[PDB]
Design a protein around this ligand. Sequence first.
Ligand SMILES: [Cl-]
Ligand SMILES: [Cl-]
Ligand SMILES: [Cl-]
Ligand SMILES: [Cl-]
Ligand SMILES: [Cl-]
Ligand SMILES: [Cl-]
Ligand SMILES: [Cl-]
Ligand SMILES: [Cl-]
Ligand SMILES: [Cl-]
Ligand SMILES: [Cl-]
Ligand SMILES: [Cl-]
Ligand SMILES: [Cl-]
Ligand SMILES: [Cl-]
Ligand SMILES: [Cl-]
Ligand SMILES: [Cl-]
Ligand SMILES: [Cl-]
Ligand SMILES: [Cl-]
Ligand SMILES: [Cl-]
Ligand SMILES: [Cl-]
Ligand SMILES: [Cl-]
Ligand SMILES: [Cl-]
Ligand SMILES: [Cl-]
Ligand SMILES: [Cl-]
Ligand SMILES: [Cl-]
Ligand SMILES: [Cl-]
Ligand SMILES: [Fe+2]
Ligand SMILES: [Fe+2]
Ligand SMILES: [Fe+2]
Ligand SMILES: [Fe+2]
Ligand SMILES: [Fe+2]
Ligand SMILES: [Fe+2]
Ligand SMILES: [Fe+2]
Ligand SMILES: [Fe+2]
Ligand SMILES: [Fe+2]
Ligand SMILES: [Fe+2]
Ligand SMILES: [Fe+2]
Ligand SMILES: [Fe+2]
Ligand SMILES: [Fe+2]
Ligand SMILES: [Fe+2]
Ligand SMILES: [Fe+2]
Ligand SMILES: [Mg+2]
Ligand SMILES: [Mg+2]
Ligand SMILES: [Mg+2]
Ligand SMILES: [Mg+2]
Ligand SMILES: [Mg+2]
Ligand SMILES: [Mg+2]
Ligand SMILES: [Mg+2]
Ligand SMILES: [Mg+2]
Ligand SMILES: [Mg+2]
Ligand SMILES: [Mg+2]
Ligand SMILES: [Mg+2]
Ligand SMILES: [Mg+2]
Ligand SMILES: [Mg+2]
Ligand SMILES: [Mg+2]
Ligand SMILES: [Mg+2]
Ligand SMILES: [Mg+2]
Ligand SMILES: [Mg+2]
Ligand SMILES: [Mg+2]
Ligand SMILES: [Mg+2]
Ligand SMILES: [Mg+2]
Ligand SMILES: [Mg+2]
Ligand SMILES: [Mg+2]
Ligand SMILES: [Mg+2]
Ligand SMILES: [Mg+2]
Lengths: 172, 172, 172, 172
Amino acid sequence: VSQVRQNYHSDCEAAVNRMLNLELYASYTYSSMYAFFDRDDVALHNVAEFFKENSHEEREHAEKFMKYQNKRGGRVVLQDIKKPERDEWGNTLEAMQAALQLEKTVNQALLDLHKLATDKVDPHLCDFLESEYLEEQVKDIKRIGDFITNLKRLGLPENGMGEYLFDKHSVK
Amino acid sequence: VSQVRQNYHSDCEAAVNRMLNLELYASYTYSSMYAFFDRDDVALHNVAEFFKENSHEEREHAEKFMKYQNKRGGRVVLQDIKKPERDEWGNTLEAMQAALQLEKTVNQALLDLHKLATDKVDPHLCDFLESEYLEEQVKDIKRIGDFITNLKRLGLPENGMGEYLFDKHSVK
Amino acid sequence: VSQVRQNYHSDCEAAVNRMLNLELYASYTYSSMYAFFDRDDVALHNVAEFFKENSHEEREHAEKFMKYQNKRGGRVVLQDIKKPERDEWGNTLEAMQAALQLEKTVNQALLDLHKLATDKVDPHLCDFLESEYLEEQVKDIKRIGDFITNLKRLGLPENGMGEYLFDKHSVK
Amino acid sequence: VSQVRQNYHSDCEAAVNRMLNLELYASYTYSSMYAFFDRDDVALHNVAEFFKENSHEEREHAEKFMKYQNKRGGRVVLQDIKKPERDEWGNTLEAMQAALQLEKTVNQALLDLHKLATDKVDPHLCDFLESEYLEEQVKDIKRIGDFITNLKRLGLPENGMGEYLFDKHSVK
Ligand SMILES: [Cl-]
Ligand SMILES: [Cl-]
Ligand SMILES: [Cl-]
Ligand SMILES: [Cl-]
Ligand SMILES: [Cl-]
Ligand SMILES: [Cl-]
Ligand SMILES: [Cl-]
Ligand SMILES: [Cl-]
Ligand SMILES: [Cl-]
Ligand SMILES: [Cl-]
Ligand SMILES: [Cl-]
Ligand SMILES: [Cl-]
Ligand SMILES: [Cl-]
Ligand SMILES: [Cl-]
Ligand SMILES: [Cl-]
Ligand SMILES: [Cl-]
Ligand SMILES: [Cl-]
Ligand SMILES: [Cl-]
Ligand SMILES: [Cl-]
Ligand SMILES: [Cl-]
Ligand SMILES: [Cl-]
Ligand SMILES: [Cl-]
Ligand SMILES: [Cl-]
Ligand SMILES: [Cl-]
Ligand SMILES: [Cl-]
Ligand SMILES: [Fe+2]
Ligand SMILES: [Fe+2]
Ligand SMILES: [Fe+2]
Ligand SMILES: [Fe+2]
Ligand SMILES: [Fe+2]
Ligand SMILES: [Fe+2]
Ligand SMILES: [Fe+2]
Ligand SMILES: [Fe+2]
Ligand SMILES: [Fe+2]
Ligand SMILES: [Fe+2]
Ligand SMILES: [Fe+2]
Ligand SMILES: [Fe+2]
Ligand SMILES: [Fe+2]
Ligand SMILES: [Fe+2]
Ligand SMILES: [Fe+2]
Ligand SMILES: [Mg+2]
Ligand SMILES: [Mg+2]
Ligand SMILES: [Mg+2]
Ligand SMILES: [Mg+2]
Ligand SMILES: [Mg+2]
Ligand SMILES: [Mg+2]
Ligand SMILES: [Mg+2]
Ligand SMILES: [Mg+2]
Ligand SMILES: [Mg+2]
Ligand SMILES: [Mg+2]
Ligand SMILES: [Mg+2]
Ligand SMILES: [Mg+2]
Ligand SMILES: [Mg+2]
Ligand SMILES: [Mg+2]
Ligand SMILES: [Mg+2]
Ligand SMILES: [Mg+2]
Ligand SMILES: [Mg+2]
Ligand SMILES: [Mg+2]
Ligand SMILES: [Mg+2]
Ligand SMILES: [Mg+2]
Ligand SMILES: [Mg+2]
Ligand SMILES: [Mg+2]
Ligand SMILES: [Mg+2]
Ligand SMILES: [Mg+2]
């Protein structure tokens, strides 16, 4: 019964709320990675800042879904933001592997929401996902996979010199 | 039998002509609103200019469909532009309510055309509607709904001071 | 057993983690307020943006505690960020009243942490709280109290014109 | 019996003189490190310059205590500046480990002086230490610990390539 609401299915409204929870969850996981790489016994500042920037990106993605919900006449419903799966992230390779899996999880949720929007015949929601989320997801997954290939090349996890070189030349 | 025509169904060609008629109809309705708010016994110039700008926007939307028709090899067929439903628009709240309904009518026609384009497997027409029309429609509907909420807050229709304040602070 | 750790009590390390949880909780509450005032049936955009900016400020405060933890050789430990107390915030006056109470809650936690830092004879932590948190808290509480006084003056909650005027002249 | 003296305990005056001796001692130790890394058989110029800059910083810290002593009406009393503990510093890792211990020694003296100032109820001296010394100490200790973690990662002391890479990418 919002005066603006048109062609917006209740199931899509709910799925949008779940999606923005997941973006906040992803933001929090990257926050955790930032703090781990900033530890004095880890001390890879370029890596830390990479994850810090990703944390802000994911928060922005969540805010964009809140704005979207309101534009369509749906109602934002928030739930707890669950803490990350780990308290410590091992090393740059383990963290990047976790980041790749997180990005693929977020991507799968976006594709699932696109499929729901398709089934409910909601082209505005389809366009929004395609224009604002799906391409950035593919780019981010490609970036992280490329990093993982380089970290393996550099001899991670055992090769500390390799880890240092990555921090100084791949995320500088 | 246009040399450029490819994957363009006769039903979509006809629906595009009907859509650009409706954009011209919407333009004319907003023209009428501009003239009403410019009356010396109405005299809400910021509101009048808001509607005047919307009238030009809708005309541009019509022209874009004419260009689209030709790009696909369809043929522009014009029909009369029907005069607006009312000759006078009451006050800012009544006008905005009429504008909201008009915008939702235009939006429904765009969504119907997108569904036809989907059924005829015409991704160029789908993309055109998504990229050029559907998002602006959602933004415009949200803007007008927000205005209506504020006009009600301000005590319209009875509260003339409220109407004055809206003209001076919401469409300045 | 961090190599950098000096004069940093385990209880202060734990209290810093709890404090940065509370800053994230406060950020999330302000996010919720932003989304409520952006609703088409609420539509007070200046108020919404005020709360959105406060949400980002609180997130920055949390990040600063993460950096602080690491600088002292403590270890960041994250917990779930609990969803806000309410899903809808009534009106500008109710929201500002909730904001005042939230700010006083955060302030009390900061003062409690300062007292713990005092008891553990940790002048670096005392200075950090005084220089980076306690003054901004007093300023923010004063700002919100001033707003509440003005919203009451303007006749909230009943006086919708008053609410409109505040949005247009106090948070413009 | 200085005309300016107020609320300045004789024990704090004496402790300030001892503190500025220790800053000069720290300056001299870093001078020694600069000269060692500038040796033709050591030849790590970026590391050498890092230590040279730290030597000047510590001298400035000493001068600031002299100015402070006079501002409070105490009397500067100088003692010999003892030569550093070592004549040669092994390698970048050994030097950084010595630097970390020196920084923690200076920090402990500053915290001890803050405790004395607290016991003598001297808030001006407390503020001075907090504002001018204690935060820079925490930052410097964190910087050196981060370096040590990276030097170990790079395989020091055995890995000469690692040592070269640190000089070229961490203190450039
Ligand atoms: Cl609907
Ligand atoms: Cl529904
Ligand atoms: Cl929901
Ligand atoms: Cl759960
Ligand atoms: Cl873990
Ligand atoms: Cl995952
Ligand atoms: Cl065709
Ligand atoms: Cl056909
Ligand atoms: Cl036709
Ligand atoms: Cl007819
Ligand atoms: Cl009429
Ligand atoms: Cl209509
Ligand atoms: Cl006014
Ligand atoms: Cl400790
Ligand atoms: Cl402890
Ligand atoms: Cl904890
Ligand atoms: Cl709980
Ligand atoms: Cl509620
Ligand atoms: Cl509270
Ligand atoms: Cl005295
Ligand atoms: Cl004395
Ligand atoms: Cl002395
Ligand atoms: Cl001696
Ligand atoms: Cl020696
Ligand atoms: Cl030492
Ligand atoms: Fe995301
Ligand atoms: Fe991403
Ligand atoms: Fe990204
Ligand atoms: Fe239009
Ligand atoms: Fe429109
Ligand atoms: Fe528009
Ligand atoms: Fe005004
Ligand atoms: Fe805060
Ligand atoms: Fe103090
Ligand atoms: Fe201070
Ligand atoms: Fe605050
Ligand atoms: Fe603030
Ligand atoms: Fe110093
Ligand atoms: Fe220092
Ligand atoms: Fe320093
Ligand atoms: Mg309603
Ligand atoms: Mg529903
Ligand atoms: Mg979920
Ligand atoms: Mg749990
Ligand atoms: Mg794109
Ligand atoms: Mg690339
Ligand atoms: Mg021909
Ligand atoms: Mg035909
Ligand atoms: Mg028609
Ligand atoms: Mg007729
Ligand atoms: Mg678009
Ligand atoms: Mg707006
Ligand atoms: Mg250790
Ligand atoms: Mg502990
Ligand atoms: Mg708590
Ligand atoms: Mg709960
Ligand atoms: Mg201050
Ligand atoms: Mg003020
Ligand atoms: Mg005298
Ligand atoms: Mg004396
Ligand atoms: Mg001494
Ligand atoms: Mg001697
Ligand atoms: Mg300071
Ligand atoms: Mg650093």
